[PDB]
């Protein structure tokens, strides 16, 4: 029996697929960095790509622990190229801000439905999102030289 | 109280460990600030803040399970290191000890089939893995 709403399941399935695309996007940044010779920037991107896949599997597991099912969707082709380093890290920041808004939106939905388990789940992700935007913002400040 | 007293003592002990961690990172900010590395100092400040929210997550979980928190004395952190690398190496050694301490609480709660504590702790095991790897990445970039 599923003890989440079909609309919170759908929302969480949508976020799982965003984390996979996030993963793919950061892998694509590594292909750029690696081609332009920045092997340490590529290495971070590959770490990030792995970590976004662990985010997606926590949603995967949560959905199944509450009796839902996961359906995987097509993943769009990510950009392969940026107009230099700053451009690449700004795209990353902009994508993380979009990811955060998307989780905040699910957090509003699950509150209106008084789903306390899902609320508790997403608060861990909010905190990680605040950390990840500030990591990228910090990179961007250091690049300003 | 719906946690065992052993798990309660272990989580209260980790809480005081996270408080000391915060204090340690703040002390690293005083070294970096004194030596003119303003950006390392800022990172250490944000980490001290973060460690405090780690501490307060253990706080709130202990009370949600019916326990009480008890604050212990906080030891005087070092305030000086041999150089930049020596400082981040102490940060790594310290995050490794925090990871082992947390893993041991995880082992204990799994023996006692305390699934809420296991679930609570797994967030921190993943955060400790990421933070250890952050220190490691900074160290490798220094060797350049
Ligand atoms: Fe993510
Ligand atoms: Fe992310
Ligand atoms: Fe911590
Ligand atoms: Fe830590
Ligand atoms: Zn590296
Ligand atoms: Zn994190
Ligand atoms: Zn992260
Ligand atoms: Zn800074
Ligand atoms: Zn952290």
Give domain limits for chain B: 5-142
Interface of B with A in 56-115 (CB under 8 A): none
Kindly report the CA angle at B35 between B32 and B20, in degrees rounded to 5? 30
B46 touches chain A (CB under 8 A): yes
Q: How close B131 comes to chain A (CA, Å)?
A: 12
B141 interfacial to chain A (CB closer than 8 Å): yes
Degrees (nearest 5) of the Cα angle B86, B130, B97? 55
Query: In CATH, which of 1.20.1260.10, 1.10.1270.20, 1.10.3430.10, 1.20.1250.20 is domain B5-142?
Result: 1.20.1260.10
List CB contacts (< 8 A) between A47 and chain B. 133, 137
Does A40 sit within 8 Å of B141, measured CB to CB? Answer: yes
* Interface membership of A40 toward B (CB under 8 Å): yes
Nearest to B126 among A40, A54, A142 (CB): A54
Of B49, B47, B55, residue with least CA distance to B13: B55
Q: Whose atoms come closest to the Cα of A143: which ligand?
A: 8
Q: CA B112: distance to chain centroid?
A: 24
CA torsion B133→B137→B143→B144, rounded to 10°?
170
Binding residue per annotation — A138?
Answer: yes
Q: Could you give the dihedral angle defined by the CA atoms of residues A48, A49, A54 and A57, in that order, rounded to the nearest 10 degrees?
A: 150
Query: Do the beta carbons of residue A13 and residue A2 sit within 8 Å?
Result: no
Q: What is the resolution of this structure in A?
A: 2.3
- Inter-residue contact B15 to B55 (CB < 8 Å): yes
In B35-83, where does DSSP find H-type helix?
38-64
Q: Which two tokens stand for residue A110?
A: 């699950």
A87 is known to lie in a ligand binding site? yes
Q: Who's near A114: CB < 8 A, 6+ residues apart?
A: none
SS3 A76: coil
Phi and psi at residue B20, to the nearest 5° = -60, -40
CA of B140 to the centre of ligand 5 (A): 7
Determine the Cα–Cα distance for residues B59 and A11; give it in Å rounded to an integer.
31
Contact between B84 and B40 (Cβ < 8 Å): yes
Q: Contact A126/A69 with Cβ under 8 angstroms?
A: no
**Total number of residues shown for chain B:** 144
Name the experiment that determined this structure.
X-ray
Look up the CATH architecture of domain A6-143. Answer: Up-down Bundle (1.20)
Cβ-based neighbours of A24, under 8 Å, separated by 6 or more: A49, A75, A78
Cβ atoms within 10 Å, residue B62? 21
Q: How far apart, in whole angstroms, are the C-alpha atoms of residue B10 and residue B117?
A: 11
């Amino acid at each position: 029996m599923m003890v989440i709403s079909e609309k919170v399941r759908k929302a969480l399935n949508d976020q799982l697929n965003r984390e996979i695309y996030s993963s793919y996007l950061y892998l694509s940044m590594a292909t750029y960095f690696d081609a332009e010779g920045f092997k340490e920037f590529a290495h971070w991107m590959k770490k990030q790509a792995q970590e976004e896949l662990t985010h997606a599997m926590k949603f995967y597991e949560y959905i199944y622990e509450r009796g839902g099912r996961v359906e995987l969707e097509a993943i769009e082709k990510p950009p392969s190229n940026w107009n230099g380093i700053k451009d690449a890290f700004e795209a990353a920041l902009k994508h993380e801000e979009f990811v955060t808004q998307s989780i905040y939106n699910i957090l509003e939905l699950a509150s209106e439905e008084k789903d306390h388990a899902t609320v508790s789940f997403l608060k861990w992700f909010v905190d990680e999102q605040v950390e990840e935007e500030d990591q990228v913002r910090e990179i961007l400040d250091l690049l300003e030289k």
